[PDB]
């Protein structure tokens, strides 16, 4: 259906309005998942054709995420296309093994994504953040001028 009337998040706003790792948001960090580990096997790739994965790693790591993260991300892909026809959801970081995120980042568990719109139009990111809240991410933070960070609770 038609684009929605939305209230965007402000730069550096997060929703819910509590720290990411608290119970009301995404909950605690449970430990890095390394490629070589048994827990790595519970991550599966998101191959949704309506999402762009940056994949600067050329490894497909950005596609790996928990099912809870995948379901929210997929809902979000639909609402982005409906909000701005001709524009898609883009993921810059999904699960990570490059190691630039703060220690205890939910990226290391496949429980977070950093996203933009596919046109990199920063005027849309506050609205993109509101759609991520509406898509059911357990925490959404307009973290940087460069991207919005979204995460989920542990399965």
Partner 1 sequence: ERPVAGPYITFTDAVNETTIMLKWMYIPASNNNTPIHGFYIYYRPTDSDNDSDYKKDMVEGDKYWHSISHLQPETSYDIKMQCFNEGGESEFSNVMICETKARK
User: Which positions ≥6 away from 124 have C-beta within 8 Å?
Assistant: 84, 87, 117
Q: To the nearest whole angstrom, how small is the minimum distance from the Cβ of residue 147 to Ca ion?
A: 11
How many angstroms separate the CA atoms of 89 and 92, rounded? 10
CA of residue 148 relative to chain centroid, distance:
7
User: Which positions ≥6 away from 37 have C-beta within 8 Å?
Assistant: none
Q: Between 62 and 109, whose beta carbon lies closer to Ca ion?
A: 62
Say which entry of Zn ion, partner 1, Ca ion, none residue 20 contacts (CB below 5 to 8 A, set by partner kind).
none
Residue 114 as a binder of Zn ion (CB under 5 A): the answer is: yes
Q: Between 3 and 99, whose beta carbon lies closer to partner 1?
A: 99
Using CB positions, name the residue nearest to Zn ion: 149
Q: Between 18 and 82, whose beta carbon lies closer to Zn ion?
A: 18
Q: 98-111 in b/e burial notation, b at 16+ Cβ within 10 A?
A: eeebeeebbbbbbb
Was 42 annotated as part of a binding site?
no
Provide the 8-state DSSP code for 131: H
Residue 143 as a binder of partner 1 (CB under 8 A): the answer is: no
Q: Between 46 and 49, whose beta carbon lies closer to Zn ion?
A: 46
- Where do runs of H (alpha helix) occur along the chain? 67-83, 125-134
Region of 24-32, 78-86, 104-112, 125-133 interacting with Zn ion (CB under 5 A): 104-112
Per CB under 8 A, residues contacting partner 1 are 52, 54-58, 92-93, 97-100, 116, 120, 144-147
């Amino acid at each position: 259906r038609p684009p929605r009337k939305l209230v965007p998040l402000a730069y550096k706003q997060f929703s819910p309005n509590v720290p990411e790792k608290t119970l009301g948001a995404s909950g605690r960090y449970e430990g890095k998942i390394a490629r070589s580990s048994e827990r790595f096997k519970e991550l599966t790739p998101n191959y949704n054709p309506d999402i762009i994965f940056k994949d600067e790693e050329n490894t497909g790591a950005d596609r790996l995420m928990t099912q809870r993260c995948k379901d929210r991300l997929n809902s979000l892909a639909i609402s982005v296309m409906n909000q701005w026809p001709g524009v898609k959801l883009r993921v810059t970081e999904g699960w990570d093994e490059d190691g630039h995120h703060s220690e205890e980042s939910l990226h290391y568990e496949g429980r977070a994504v950093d996203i933009t719109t596919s046109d990199r139009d920063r005027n849309k990111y506050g609205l993109l953040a509101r759609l991520a809240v509406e898509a059911g991410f357990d925490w959404v933070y307009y973290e940087s001028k460069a991207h919005v960070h979204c995460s989920v609770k542990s399965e």
